[PDB]
Structure 1
Amino acid sequence: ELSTLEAEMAVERKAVEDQRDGELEARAQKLEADLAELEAEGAKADARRKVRDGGEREMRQIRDRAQRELDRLEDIWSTFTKLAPKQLIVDENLYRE
C-alpha cells in the first residue's frame, strides 16, 4: 500500500503548500494596499516603516506556521516508512497521528 499512501501524503502536503501560498499572497497584497493608503494620507516615512515591518513579521508568521505543519507531516511520513519494532515514539501527538 506504499504507493497509495505516498500519493495521499503528497496531495496533503501540496494542500498545505497551496494554502500557505494563498494566505501569503493575500497578506502581501494587503501590505501593498496599506502602504498605498498611508501614502494617500499623511505619509510618515517612519509609520510606513512600522507597517512594513508588521506586514513582513506577519508573513514570516504565516510561512513559519505552514512550515512547521509541513515538517510535522514530513516526520510522520518518514517515521511510518522506516517504522520497526523496538522503535521508541516519544511524542504523543506524532503517535496519535
Structure 2
Amino acid sequence: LEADLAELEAEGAKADARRKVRDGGEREMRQIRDRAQRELDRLEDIWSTFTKLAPKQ
C-alpha cells in the first residue's frame, strides 16, 4: 500500500484516488488482522475448553 501510494504521488493523481487506494489497503489490512485475531481467539477457545474441561461438559 505504501509503494502504491508513492506511485500515485509520483503520477500526480487526485487525492480522491489516494483515499480510494488507501481505504482499500486499510480495509484489507483490517480484514487480515481480524482473521488473525479470529484464529487467535479460536486457539484461545481451544485452550480454555481444554485446560478448563471436566466431564458433564
TM > 0.5? yes
Determine if the alignment matches structure 1 residue 80 to structure 2 residue 41: no
TM-score by length of 1: 0.57
Instruction: Count residues in correspondence.
Output: 57
* 2:34 alignment partner in structure 1: 64
- Of the two structures, which has the highest relative contact order with CA contacts closer than 8 Å and spacing of 6 or more? 1
Deviation digits for residues 8-60 of structure 1, max 9, x if unmatched? xxxxxxxxxxxxxxxxxxxxxxx110000011113211011100000100010
> How far, CA to CA, are the matches of 2:5 and 2:52 in structure 1?
49
Long gaps (5+) in structure 2: none
Corresponding residue number in structure 2 for 1:55: 25
Structure 2 distance, partners of 1:68, 1:75, is 10
Seq. identity, %: 100
Runs of 4+ with deviation above 2 angstroms? none
State TM-score, norm by structure 2: 0.95
Unaligned runs of 5+ in 1: 1-30, 88-97
